[model samples]
Target chain A: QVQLVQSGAEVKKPGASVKVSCKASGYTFTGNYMHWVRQAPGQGLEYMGWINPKSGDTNYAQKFQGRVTMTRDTSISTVYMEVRRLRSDDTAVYYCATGWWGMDVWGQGTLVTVSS
Target chain B: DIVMTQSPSSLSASVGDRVTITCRASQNINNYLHWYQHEPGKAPKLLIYAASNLQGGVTSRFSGSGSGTDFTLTISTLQPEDFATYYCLQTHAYPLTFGGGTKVDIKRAA
Candidate 1:
């Protein structure tokens, strides 16, 4: 089945950085845009940003602009999100969405926890 | 930022029954609203987009309708597999916002 498989969980200390990857299968990754979403503890979902594989352009919610960087390697059909200056508040499950504005596809999700 | 609100927080229902869940936006969000179904321990999947259009491989019984700031997602026949959390997303502005969420259940409301 078509799916977005994300990297496993990560354990980082405060003020560090972590990068997660989502490898695409059963679809042409380069043809579609990739989106990232954040699910914080006891809170609803938040749209982080998105990257166009074909155009290599990106767009981010104002709150996420300097917090995360989205990149894609069409050759391997993989997309990644590198989060910098991690804090305890950044602990949450992050997911990758594939498609245009309305992304129906999602990854299993990667849990990131920043400890002191 | 467009704030989306889902009513009832949660609702109780049974199989083969008809039901509807409502969502409202703080401002006029036009019809750029989308609905999603998410089960515990799983990711959300798009059910309705642009208000009424169903996503690929979704059941025909699932329908949505609304304009301006109000909308509704109606399920003609609820199935056992349909019990899950539902969310509404507002994409009419920057920094998209989502409704709190509603979870479908299989019990009669008292």
Candidate 2:
């Protein structure tokens, strides 16, 4: 079965950084583009960006352009999303997903809590 | 960025009632629209993709239709497990965007 297992919850002080990992199994990791999404507590989903696991090319949503970074380790079939300069507003659950046109498979989600 | 506008922000209905949620995009997006169901603390589930194609493992009662900026997700027969938030997403352009979401709740017994 195809699965995207993610890292655990993280609690970080404001201005700190957090890196979440999503390890893919049961398929060729580099064959598809990995995408990242965010959901603030009680808020709607936000598309952060996508990264090509094969070529390392990436594109970010204008709102998250500089706040988030995406990279992958093909050797381990894992993708990572790093958020820097965190703030309380950045507290949310992050998900990694992949698909052809729309995201079909998704990670369970990693919660990042940014507080003072 | 494309703006996705979802209607009825929320709704309450009894089981077996038909429920429909609408989503409109800022610009034409062809049939690149998809719908997802989300329950608190769980991964969002894909219901429909490419406008009306139901995802594997999803029940037939859940259907979708529309193109070119307008889309709709309809539950032919709402069940107890159907109460959740629904969102529409557009993959037609960069910086993909999702609708605000429509919360579906079960009507209280009278």
Candidate 3:
């Protein structure tokens, strides 16, 4: 019943920006925080940060501070993330997780491929 | 940011064998640690929270134990389906950090 469904994968050119979405169901949207994580192919997971749907407040990891933005649409139970100033190195699988800090629910993941 | 280091980066184990992965933190994190499993192309799933408490539906074979800056996730009897990378997360600190992860591989017989 409870699920976090994310948008499909994407392929884009370098320097371009992309927006990824995560739609939640079976729970109150504003009651939890949505967190972002990334995994470069064969690499370890990296925490991007989190956003509170009700307050629209966000926190980002120092490394991703200027590279990513997170937002949410409580009306549709969807959370979104936009990555800007993309580079080939930005290619990775991005995920939206729902919880306070230690995530309990997660989206399927959105794979973004940034090629030259 | 808390740094978590996992041991035995990768290991080959047979079904029914005991599997144990260890994680060490840069500093004491009390008991706020969790474990997760990452399968190929799928979102990682939480297996244990607050150190030893198993998440919903997770089998009893998966267990955790640790305190302060040290932790361990042990699989009492490894199963074929348990062959995957396991990561440790420290929830007590800011900028939540995850262990590099220890991969469990299948062990084949001769």
* Candidate 2 error regions (>4 Å): none
True contacts kept of 3: 0.79
Which run of 10 residues does model 1 chain B get worst, by summed lDDT?
B101-110
Q: Please give the DockQ score of every candidate, comma-separated.
A: 0.48, 0.79, 0.76
lDDT of 1: 0.84
TM-score of candidate 1 relative to the true fold: 0.78
Q: What CA root-mean-square deviation does each model show from the true structure?
A: 3.3, 1.7, 1.8
Predicted complex 3: CAPRI docking category: medium
CA-based DockQ, model 3 = 0.76
**Tens-place lDDT digits, model 3, residues A1-116:** 66999999999998899999999988888988888888887777878888889999998988889888999988898889999999877899999887755677788889999987
Q: Sort every candidate by DockQ, greatest first.
A: 2, 3, 1
| Model 1 CAPRI rating | acceptable
TM-score per candidate, in order? Answer: 0.78, 0.92, 0.91
lDDT accuracy of residue B15 in candidate 1? 81
Task: Report lDDT (CA) for all predictions.
Answer: 0.84, 0.90, 0.88
Best by lDDT: 2
lDDT of 2 by residue, A39-79 (tens): 88878888899999999999998988888889999999999
Candidate 2, residue A104: lDDT? 75
lDDT of 2 by residue, B67-106 (tens): 9988999999989999889999998987788899999999
Chain B TM-score by candidate, in order shown: 0.93, 0.96, 0.96
Query: Per-residue CA lDDT of candidate 1, range A1-116, in tens?
Result: 67999999999998898999999998777777888887877566778888888878888877778888888888889998999989888998999987645566889999999988
